[PDB]
Design a protein around this ligand. Structure first.
Ligand SMILES: NC(=O)c1ccc[n+]([C@@H]2O[C@H](COP(=O)([O-])OP(=O)(O)OC[C@H]3O[C@@H](n4cnc5c(N)ncnc54)[C@H](O)[C@@H]3O)[C@@H](O)[C@H]2O)c1
Ligand SMILES: NC(=O)c1ccc[n+]([C@@H]2O[C@H](COP(=O)([O-])OP(=O)(O)OC[C@H]3O[C@@H](n4cnc5c(N)ncnc54)[C@H](O)[C@@H]3O)[C@@H](O)[C@H]2O)c1
Ligand SMILES: NC(=O)c1ccc[n+]([C@@H]2O[C@H](COP(=O)([O-])OP(=O)(O)OC[C@H]3O[C@@H](n4cnc5c(N)ncnc54)[C@H](O)[C@@H]3O)[C@@H](O)[C@H]2O)c1
Ligand SMILES: NC(=O)c1ccc[n+]([C@@H]2O[C@H](COP(=O)([O-])OP(=O)(O)OC[C@H]3O[C@@H](n4cnc5c(N)ncnc54)[C@H](O)[C@@H]3O)[C@@H](O)[C@H]2O)c1
Ligand SMILES: [Zn+2]
Ligand SMILES: [Zn+2]
Ligand SMILES: [Zn+2]
Ligand SMILES: [Zn+2]
Lengths: 356, 356, 356, 356
């Protein structure tokens, strides 16, 4: 009998509350794709939400979908046209890969390309499996002094990088970050790395705020039942001034209103968190003080920069990982996520290496 | 007896529905100010609103306030430190003059200076009178080939210049302008002068849209009871694509929502129109497609540019003037404004010259 | 006997002074390429220089090269993956097509991609022939009201568009354009279309300056033997001020120095013309007044905008065409170019349609 | 007899090699000025150059000029219109203060205002004395946790802040800094604080490079007689890529050329160093790869930011101070500077407090 073939066990969502571990064919890379032996994949609210509700807004799982989109792996095989990667290369995978070179791509904002492929966003299958193929241009080699988990953390870190860029965060800025979830945390890390003089972080959880303090938050504010205006007042009282940039990472209407009231005139309020379709806010207040309201849709051109920051030890995201499980314990990992006691949970897909 | 002294008849609002023509002392210019013999002053909804309600938002007339803030005049006398202006110079007056060189002025956005002085915005007296003194740095000499009325029209034109700048309007753009009032009209003029390939103007009035066409609107849409999504659909239908920039000049919530749905991803929605304190809008929609929402608060650094555009005949604002009255007929002029049949009404304050 | 096959007569440069018309195989389009029946191709100094010297700097013809890179044509056949174009579509061809999605492409500046393919720049064959294949993403459909020659003129127009963007040309600017060659002319057209209040054009030829006047030049200055400082003085005297932007389209050292001396502090000097490897200039003068010196390497993201400006009749480049010849008279066309009496010479490659 | 009056001993240059300590009248502050009891004043090559040659370029000392322009002090008295400062306030003094609100000030680039007043640049007297009056808008209160010397170091630090801003230095960038003098050093500090992943510093002195390493330089290159291309090659060799930004802080022609060759395409070469009037450089090389060349003229809008960075301990400039002398030993301090063995020399003007 022939030698046993490799397997491609994958974590799949079939519908609400229907999560399964099942085998998939081994992908074959096209001329400009590479086949990756998946190593580390972090999970986030998006994956868990698809599992629980089978959808996220207009994004609905109409057919079984493989989850996972924050990952790194090892190049197993390369397509006939791939030149910058070779078997054995450790790489970080940027999940959003444009299908066509449209005007958004040409202008440098490929994240807005309407037909972009994106891991784990229906109908595009994610990378929480053994073997995964991806456009080679969006697989970035990791330096030897950067771990697989760091490579996987580049995905959430990139949201923070993109958010701070969109907000214009720069040297000496006083920045308000609403929310101490993993997104608010990476935003904090990026803001400090970009030279923000003071970063104030808010959240409903004292626990998450204490963690924020641990990694650099200069000031923290636990939100209980204060009004948006009161929050803005407390933030300003703590900073001794109004923050030039507010990065909203909760998606909560009250927080958005607070961001509008708190941001300095001529400043920028970046909306990262996703809330409901409609939001009632004091637009007049923001518009009249020229406080710009800029949204964020994932990211663009952040992987090389993230890798440079990690390789130079300019930022430390390792503290973000609070738990790791092998791919096979995905269900246990998802249930753990729901407990909401951690931050970032890593899934280890390569049986030959379960290390960071 | 001595020769008769000059007079400074002024148009003053004492409260809701209390408009009066009364004499004021002749201002004496300080070292860095100039005394102007007012010539042409255009009036707008702001002046009329202070007349009708004695206030606009939180800006309330607590003591009689002279109206007018869109003006030009002739330098009568100059302060001991003034050197760029001399008696006889025809000048356009920029109404907003900072009282202190704060961080906003230093960074180039003096319009956001908290303590800025602004004509006809309580408690600062306007210039609808015979003689008015103003900071010399904010009085700009008009070239011989630019009329006083064009000089007065620089104020509303500047709102359009600032709005298009904030929106990033540039060569080849498809621009949507919501509202065909004088503000939407100057915005249309500026957008076209900046190279916009197509400008679509919307409004409830067919008459205003017809006028928009006359001065350059490539396409127009009369709005009735369509929903914001339907408006967005129609605009896109006319353009065959989504406008990269939308300049909202109505303040109507429905129009703001339409702008969010209509604007191309990565584009900009500029909020010029003033509406209610709170607004319900689809921020999530704008965020996911990175449609920036930028407000406008008057303007900054637009007078020299406006003057250059007028002197080179790059724009023609004259069609905006639909009526002109001598200062003494200010009441009739405000009554005519209330008829909402015109566009821009000019008040002529210099008895020696009532010409454009 | 079988029907006669089509031909692909091409204009080829074999070495200095060795220009030949010879037949080439009919290209076969790959999955994302389209085969074009070439219609109109404009020629410029680059093509003529390759013919005369067999090279341009480090760009040397090491093997016979087909000339031509300013063109338009009709889609003859489309690759299996092409979706936005179909046979019969009239298209404008952007000559620079990236071979790989590197960081320059992702960041929105594909013109800087080191491995970019570019028509008629050794070793990449141009499109002065009957049939030519090209990446479909870089073939743009022409509206019915835009001619083939206009489509071909988009290439030089794009240099002007890119140059003005790089220079920050905007509403009300006083712009100095050095050189009245076709590049200086399209720059002039673009500057005016972007809202420049006054454009001053310089040149050694009164003839070219008169042509410049005809298409919009507000002011012209024929250069004889004045020094750079004298030129700067005359330009300022004519404008009554220093231009905020200077676009150098001659590549001449003296002109570059003049641009440095003439540009307003805080302004921008754009270098479009190609001179010698080294240039002696008053860097200190520019640097100390923060006059930025920005170069231009062809263009990026200008075709859709150019098409929008042409389709909306916002700019008129037709006056630029001073002569047209069928492909077969290429030698006569090149000799005519050398006479330097015209501006843009068009080659007509489609025997079935020799019209504009 | 009456009580002894205070003195205003000043360090004055009468001409080449003619430095004197002499008494000046005590300045009386105007309505918008403040009188400062000078505390700490750092000296730099500019002060020393005026001493040695009695001039710098076209700025010539035609009458005795008080030196010093990098200072901090204590508010002694305030003008009748000053409200943001009071007696006893510790403040940092920004030396460049505009005399008129011209278009440069209005646009946010007051450093380019032609009539700007600037300490110790003939004919404007500096602040190396006991009492000095200055525009109140340009005196910034220092937080309690920021020393007077740090306040004085804000001036050179601001050159670095402005330079990095002009260069677009940001997160993850690889930056090349040419020159390890105090200017290159502060530039290094700022680049790292702004998130640069790697900063390479070059210099002729191994000692200065060793000091650069001590404060953060990731890589250093000692320059001997290598050519500009060789320097560019070596820099790239160390980084494994080309730096996105190069900040030239030597003024040496060879270094400027190296910067052009070394900078990544689409990147920026910032010219801070002052050299000869004319410079021979490969502009064609920079243009073809769109390497922008931006000069720096002091700074604008950097004091509040510097103060925020110092108060938050985001940067440490203290290591730059290599020696401190009381005002009375100014001659010895200038002699020590000429020994070129230190970096930043501080002069202590307040006899009541000679501490940092
Ligand atoms: N736009 C994008 O591209 C993108 C990509 C990733 C995540 N997101 C979104 O960003 C948001 C943050 O995600 P995450 O993983 O950090 O989520 P999370 O749930 O882990 O963290 C959100 C935090 O907000 C806090 N919070 C809730 N309401 C608050 C309020 N009113 N005031 C202050 N704090 C409040 C919560 O206690 C929590 O710690 C989510 O809405 C997520 O969907 C956006
Ligand atoms: N932010 C600023 O600095 C600033 C300065 C000037 C004016 N403004 C504001 O800009 C707005 C425009 O003022 P204006 O003088 O042109 O006013 P206006 O009343 O003359 O014109 C407003 C126009 O909007 C139209 N309109 C109303 N609802 C509409 C809708 N749903 N769809 C389309 N069109 C609609 C009206 O028919 C009218 O023609 C006002 O709200 C004014 O207060 C702002
Ligand atoms: N960087 C790019 O991507 C790019 C692409 C196209 C062309 N170019 C370059 O732009 C330049 C202009 O090309 P073109 O087709 O218009 O060339 P051209 O030869 O037709 O025109 C150049 C003009 O400059 C004038 N001139 C020469 N020296 C002058 C001086 N000292 N003062 C004033 N005028 C002077 C000439 O009389 C002539 O009219 C060339 O150097 C060309 O190679 C650059
Ligand atoms: N533009 C402005 O606003 C402004 C303000 C401050 C200083 N500056 C200028 O910036 C420059 C830096 O001044 P500073 O105080 O640091 O001077 P400095 O003399 O202390 O330092 C200059 C350094 O350059 C090094 N150097 C010289 N030639 C070199 C070369 N070819 N390669 C590499 N290194 C080389 C020297 O060894 C020295 O360490 C000076 O030219 C100064 O005039 C400009
Ligand atoms: Zn995620
Ligand atoms: Zn008005
Ligand atoms: Zn060409
Ligand atoms: Zn100094």
């Amino acid at each position: 009998a022939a030698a046993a073939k490799p397997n491609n066990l994958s974590l799949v969502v079939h519908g609400p509350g229907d999560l399964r571990l099942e085998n998939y064919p081994i992908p074959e890379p096209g001329p400009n794709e590479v086949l990756l032996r998946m190593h580390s994949v972090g999970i986030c609210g998006s994956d868990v939400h698809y599992w629980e509700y089978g959808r996220i807004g207009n994004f609905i799982v109409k057919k079984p979908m493989v989850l996972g989109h924050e990952a790194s792996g090892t190049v197993e095989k390369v397509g006939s046209s791939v030149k910058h990667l070779k078997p054995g290369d450790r790489v970080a995978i940027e999940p959003g890969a444009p299908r066509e070179n449209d005007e958004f791509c040409k202008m440098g904002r490929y994240n807005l390309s309407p037909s972009i492929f994106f891991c784990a966003t229906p109908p595009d299958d994610g990378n929480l499996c053994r073997f995964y193929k991806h456009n080679a241009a969006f697989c970035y080699k990791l330096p030897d002094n950067v771990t697989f988990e760091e490579g996987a953390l580049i995905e959430p870190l990139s949201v923070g990088i993109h958010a701070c860029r969109r907000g214009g965060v720069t040297l000496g800025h006083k920045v308000l970050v609403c929310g101490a979830g993993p997104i608010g945390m990476v935003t904090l890390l990026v803001a400090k790395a970009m030279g923000a003089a003071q970063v104030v972080v808010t959240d409903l959880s004292a626990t998450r705020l204490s963690k924020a303090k641990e990694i650099g938050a200069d000031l923290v504010l636990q939100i209980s039942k204060e009004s948006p205006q009161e929050i803005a007042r407390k933030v300003e009282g703590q900073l001794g001034c109004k923050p030039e940039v507010t990065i909203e990472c909760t998606g909560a209407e009250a927080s958005i209103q607070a961001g509008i009231y708190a941001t300095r005139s001529g400043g920028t309020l970046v909306l990262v968190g996703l809330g409901s379709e409609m939001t009632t806010v004091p637009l007049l207040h923001a518009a009249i003080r020229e406080v710009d309201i800029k949204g964020v849709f994932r990211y663009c051109n952040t992987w090389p920069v993230a890798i440079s920051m990690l390789a130079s030890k300019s930022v430390n995201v390792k503290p973000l990982v609070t738990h790791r499980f092998p791919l096979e314990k995905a269900l246990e990992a998802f249930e753990t996520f729901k407990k909401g006691l951690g931050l970032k949970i890593m899934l280890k897909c390569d049986p030959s290496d379960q290390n960071p």
